[model samples]
Target: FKTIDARRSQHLDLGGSLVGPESVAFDGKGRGPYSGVSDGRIMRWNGEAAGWSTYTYSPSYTKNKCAASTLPTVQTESKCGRPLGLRFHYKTGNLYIADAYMGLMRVGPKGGEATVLAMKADGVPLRFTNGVDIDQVTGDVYFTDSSMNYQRSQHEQVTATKDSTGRLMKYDPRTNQVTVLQSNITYPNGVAMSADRTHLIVALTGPCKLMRHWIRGPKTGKSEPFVDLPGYPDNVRPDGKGGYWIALHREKYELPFGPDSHLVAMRVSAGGKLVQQMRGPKSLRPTEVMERKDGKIYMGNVELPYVGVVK
Candidate 1:
């Protein structure tokens, strides 16, 4: 119930009308930083410079749909066009972006072309591709398909359905194959893989917690509760260090007084305890996070305007 504030000195807003800002990823050299904005632009923070810049501008489609032609501008989709997650493939170093409206995308470094990596699963268009993670060992890309109802920008709709369309999936670049790993989830948001790549940490939004799914031997394909949070997590980042940081879109309250309570009631009655403890009061959409070699944790929250430092 403690409210944490990012207004503290550890983090400061850089500037912009940025909101619903989702993923954050450093370039292969960790020199350039990038974030997907609601305005359809993949923005970058150049290390050599000291301000914001546009790395890749999205193409203008007829109405938010994918464009077959070349990109036109660094912009957001016309509708449901918010980018939700971003991850860098260890093997290819290509950026895997999860666009809420467009599905999974591949962005090359140094102003290269954009490519569509995945769009749907089971023949259904991905509703809201939320968070993404790359397995350090196998270099496989794992991500979250949050829901078929909510679609990232529409939390109200998601609360109503409370349907389990959330899923965890993997993209093997070597084989160019995308596999669905888990299909039953309330709202899977942020995704994080363990150092050894044996387990995955997912931000199950509806339940307000992080879940772990085993991907390696002895426990392959099994999933369980990882962290029960007090706040709603939009994304989770495994800071190469021992710990991970989760970004909260908003403070979690008492079920929002609706059908969303179903998730709460079930979790409460199951073990007489909730699955995860949410981060309340101190709300942050900490969209992405990075762990430095010096033992500092840097985080990016949706629309914060600046990076965050988590101790």
Candidate 2:
């Protein structure tokens, strides 16, 4: 019923580095699309003279050793630190990352080694720190530690066992304190601050649904399901309006070579109704869909060697 539009998008071929960019982000000054690479390094696309250039080095990532050869990452990722989600505090222009092994980390706007913000919350260590988002008004960080027992390398085992050990946490930059907002969550991945700043939308990938957790009003700590997705969801991003854009890895029971175009992302209105949907040939599995102020939607894929901009 729908058309495949993947071929219409312009792919940004990275010349400086190869594969791996979990979540794509633009700086406060609108100078990026900074992302994490497989080698435990964060990179940025410089306008032309340079392509994707190294921006930040993970605290434990050995620079020369990581770039030693283009290799598979699973084994080296744990110690090398696979940085997944990247978000910038608009006001502070500070970059934050959820490194699967190193926990929550951040670096200055100028780009350098990061400061681990919350390696452990609620007295338990963060085992699979997945995605992160920042409250531009309060500087408080809202992020997810996907599991207490599994890491990114063992991600399949997490969903296989129907794990509910994941947690949604808040980090107070003012007090340098870590607080657990919700625990016992199953495969919670990315988070986004609601447009009104009254609540947050969290994706529980295991159940393919979104939860609205009140954050500003009196019922601030309580939560309820916001919307159910057609497929497993990954990152949730503010549509730069009052709505949100959600990326789905694939539709449930999706046939690999089926004739139907796969739904890769959807936009939901502020009130939570599905507003729009985008489809692609079953070839691209996007982990994040970012809506830029300039009216462009960028899809980030972990395996793709290039960033795909929806045309």
Candidate 3:
């Protein structure tokens, strides 16, 4: 058996070229850790030789302000657009994106400008569109809008006021319909469809727990509290082996105690039991851990300049 420990982690350093590869995805051809970054572009790690390159962008802006961006992206993201969750619909070979300001969209297999699917659901504009995942069998998409009142950059304000305006939604590409599955959710972050395709697992950052919303089972449209996590969670990804890798953004006690000296992410079994962990240095408050088919994991973190890789 091989060790999947963080101490053995390597780097896919962006070197401050961009920030926040919030989540990673592999295409149908096994082509990436395709990630969404702060400057509103989705990029792919094209092996060590070719390295990182732009795959597509989210904003429909022709103003070019989206292209000429600045540091600390927060100041420009409102106009430039921030791409958060990234996923590829393997069956169709399309990349689905959840842009914090742009709402839900899809880019063709060749990549370029992503077409917006929906800016509003129930006549409400998507304010802080966050994570996304696709049902491989049905081609349906699931995503989270973290809040109605506050944008993601003001994330602290959502936590400060305990905003319960978050929502979980479903999007069907065949008919182009966007439907809200759950409303008034408190700080919903990442989303992933279960291996069995029965329900979706959503992270509740405000309460430090996971919520399972049934989509096709007897409890369809029902929200069931899944499991309490060790800390606030950012992104959740299916491990392809009937489990999930969830990133604990930071421990509850991380404050005042100073830098990190604990686990960075967790691998939970199909039954919601913690099976393993990845621990690393202080700079690793990862946003997600995507376990590849070969057993390696790619780490996504908003604050870090590099993507962590583990075998």
Candidate 4:
């Protein structure tokens, strides 16, 4: 708990153009803390001189098309592209991406144009493909479709109307099969595999809940509540041990403007016990929380132009 003090924090500026880094992931070789930004492009941080450079963009669009799709309004998301959750396959070295507009995709370890994996399931198009994670042993990609009706551009509106058409899905790269694991979820967001590899945790953003679904045990195919958070949750990441770190989009609730709250990240045990909670500076609005093996915790936001690192 002492190691997560915000007083020892350091900010890594991502530059103005790289705003709204919804999620962050590190490559196998530790060469990047790559982020999928608002402009339909993925950017990689290469330290000082290099700063943040383009890693790749959605294959369906051109760089010029993405450049024109800015913030304030993502009305061009269908053509301009918008990526959300990111995860790297440890064995294959491919970065798996859950693009809100491009569907499930992945690029080579070297980073270039990504290839689409699955865009639809059950003949229904993925409306808002969001959070993602991979099962290391089976090579199965698990992700979330935030809403079956709303797009990323209308996120605030979804919360305002309390839409509950979200879904949890799985993609098997081996056979190229896409399956809906859970349906009728209320804004399913972040996803992370359990350290034991038997179950996975999902953040239900609209309902402020964490759900656990078993995959390999006697409880397989069953969904249960893991924890109910005080505020909305975005992404959930493993703590490199048996616990999970969840990014609370806000510390309290506010109507109309869902993001009007403080920034907070909480670490919880696999048993649903709260381990620790860390608060960030005002209006951080963190969307993801990642813990590195060396004990550094990184927070990424969709509104801030910097990644917060707690030393």
Q: Which candidate wins on TM-score?
A: 3
TM per prediction:
0.77, 0.93, 0.94, 0.92
Report the lDDT tens digits of candidate 3 across residue range 1-311.
Answer: 22255766788877456878988788999987888887888888988788898888865543555675555577778777888888899887999999999899899999988888988989999999998999988899999999999997897787789999999999998899999999999999999999888888999887888889999967999998788887788899988789998998777555353333466777778788878766566577788888886868888988777788987
Give the TM-score (vs. native) of candidate 4.
0.92
For model 4, the superposed segments whose C-alpha errors exceed 4 Å read 67-73, 253-263
Per-residue alpha-carbon lDDT of candidate 4 for residues 1-311, written as tens digits (9 for 90 to 100): 64255544677777665577788788888875788876677888788677898887787667545555454425566876788899999898999989998899988878789999988987889989999999988889999999988888888766778898888888999889998888888889999998888888999888888999888868987999999887789999988778988988776544342332243778889898888877545576778888888877777888777777775
Instruction: Provide the clash count, candidate 1.
Output: 24
Could you give the C-alpha RMSD of every candidate to the true structure, in order shown?
A: 6.7, 2.4, 2.3, 3.4
Candidates in descending TM-score order: 3, 2, 4, 1
TM-score of 2: 0.93
Q: What pairs collide in candidate 4?
A: none
Q: Please give the lDDT score at residue 67 for candidate 1.
A: 34
In angstroms, the error of model 3 at 132 is: 0.6
Candidate 2 lDDT over 214-236, as tens digits, reads 88878989989898988788899
Best by lDDT: 3
